[PDB]
Symmetry: C5
Subunit: 162 residues, 5 copies
């Protein structure tokens, strides 16, 4: 029974000018233990993890003459069909800013007890998704690089071979 | 007897260059339960709602070379003729900023007990309006997207069919 | 015996490019009860007012490529000849910033007991002035819009006809 | 035995483009009672002053497309030969920023008991210097205007005639 | 047995346009007592130093039209082969920002008891490294100037001749 903390990049995308209109989904990746690089080498030990805190950052990178914008949130449904504006805006801990403006997400997690390995049902292995989509129309080349700030309490030891 | 919280976009407008001079009303929409998308599916249950807290944001989106400005407020008169600068400026919880500057409204609500359905008198169904108007003369394409942050205590159950 | 609060614009000026060099007085208006629009309809009732708190804002509006600057203060002498830099800088609660930078004045008032109507002596009807002057040389069109934040305790009822 | 407070500009310089490379000393003036305009008319009364607090600001004024930078500090040696980068950086309460970025110096004074009039030894009449030098290479016309925030306890009355 | 504090520049680099793509290591210097200029004249006295606090700043200097970015961290391995993105991101106290954005590192030191002089093993003379690398593609000439904020408790007197 341990307690791990850290900070990890989830994903990164670059968007040229003109491409990246409103509703263009910038990035969409679930919170599976494979993506976090310190926890990916620590979910290969234990079997069950239960998240205590989980916060995000967005940290986009563009000059101050682009002037579009984005929206970011957290959906605790690890489903496979959510491409819209309205569900991201209405969740708890959602932000909206410009492409040179950095915000901070403090979402509403599940506090259940999950499983580390992959399986047939996705609702017991990944406590949420992160969806990011543009809302204006970009002018220059932007560069988003989303982060994560996790803290978890792995238990019941094993050793997987993924 | 419940208590709901959330955060919801009210409205959104885009303004080209040249159009949008001083006193051009950018957006003007009352706080009716239809506009908030999580509360619109929850005012269809109950009958009476009484707001506890209600705060706003403006979050406009433009590059830093536009240089106009705006003013935002909250009028607890849900009337149908208010197109001026002076009444918005003089209320409680009014802001003024540039089009690339985001502020936060903490207004003075009514704390009465209202009704959810539409009716002949508007003073018992919507506790205020939101008026937003430009004060300078824009240079580039701006993009405002006002928000809301409501909290309410719906009671006496029913089921409407609007 | 009452207590009023609020927030009110005092004045507004626009300055083209080239005009508005150093020492050009941007705006200079005393704090008479006529200028505040909610208190102007409330000094017409009572006779004596004594200010409790009084704070200011500047809120200028220009793009981030102008690069001049300003200085703002508060002089509790309601005289009629003060056009200089040194007296504004040396008062209590003075600020200095750029034309796209907004500051906040917390001045040193008089806490005496004044009169509302106009009279032969100016030292009993207006507890200060607001002087604003440029210090650099502007590049683009700026737009200043000074504010006020007053709180006062009107007493001894009457009714004037100004 | 008194206690005076206030705020005063020390100096001001303007730097054209190209001139003002790295190590170009922008301004260098000691803290003599002559330079502060409210204390200059109050050091002409008393004889001995002992500083209680002393803080600075820099407040430079340029558009956001210049992109050089500066460094600022406080040296409690009122000597007459200090033209370098390393001694300013290594003191207590030193700052570094861009030419459109404003910082705040909270230095380490002497808390001795000095003399107001000029004399043969400089170490008993001025408790420090202020040196400001560029570190990049400017692009546009900048305009620095350093400030001061003094508080002192003049005593033993006299009257000088400087 | 003493306690020293201060603030010192570690290093400085300038990057032209085009050069300085992603993964280009901007600066990489260990925390040896030679680099800090006040502690370099104080490690020549004592023999053993044990750090109490150690924090960093980045303070980069460019106009707001460059729009690349960086990442900064602290590795308590004073090894000689670490040129990657992933190890810097995953440490404790790592930051990411734009080239006109300044952040602050609060790292995780070793709190052991080291030696001041150079030796055959590097793990007893320098409690960490500082690696800084670009993540976007620069547009204009940037100018980074990293800082340090150390506090240490030198003991057991000697005198080296390096």
């Amino acid at each position: 029974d341990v307690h791990l903390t850290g900070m990890s990049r989830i994903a990164q995308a670059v968007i040229p000018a003109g491409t990246g209109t409103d509703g263009y989904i910038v990035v969409d990746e679930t919170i599976v233990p494979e993506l976090l690089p310190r926890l990916g080498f620590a979910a290969r030990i234990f079997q069950r993890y239960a998240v205590e805190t989980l916060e995000f950052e967005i940290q986009p990178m563009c000059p101050a003459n682009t002037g579009g914008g984005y929206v970011a949130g957290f959906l605790p449904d690890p489903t496979d069909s959510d491409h819209t504006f309205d569900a991201i805006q209405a969740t708890r801990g959602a932000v909206v800013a410009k492409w040179w403006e950095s915000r901070t997400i403090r979402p509403q997690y599940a506090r259940a007890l999950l499983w580390t390995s992959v399986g047939k049902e996705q609702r017991l292995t990944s406590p949420g998704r992160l969806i990011l989509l543009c809302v204006g129309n970009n002018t220059d080349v932007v560069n988003v690089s989303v982060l994560c700030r996790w803290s978890v309490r792995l238990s019941v030891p094993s050793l997987e071979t993924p």
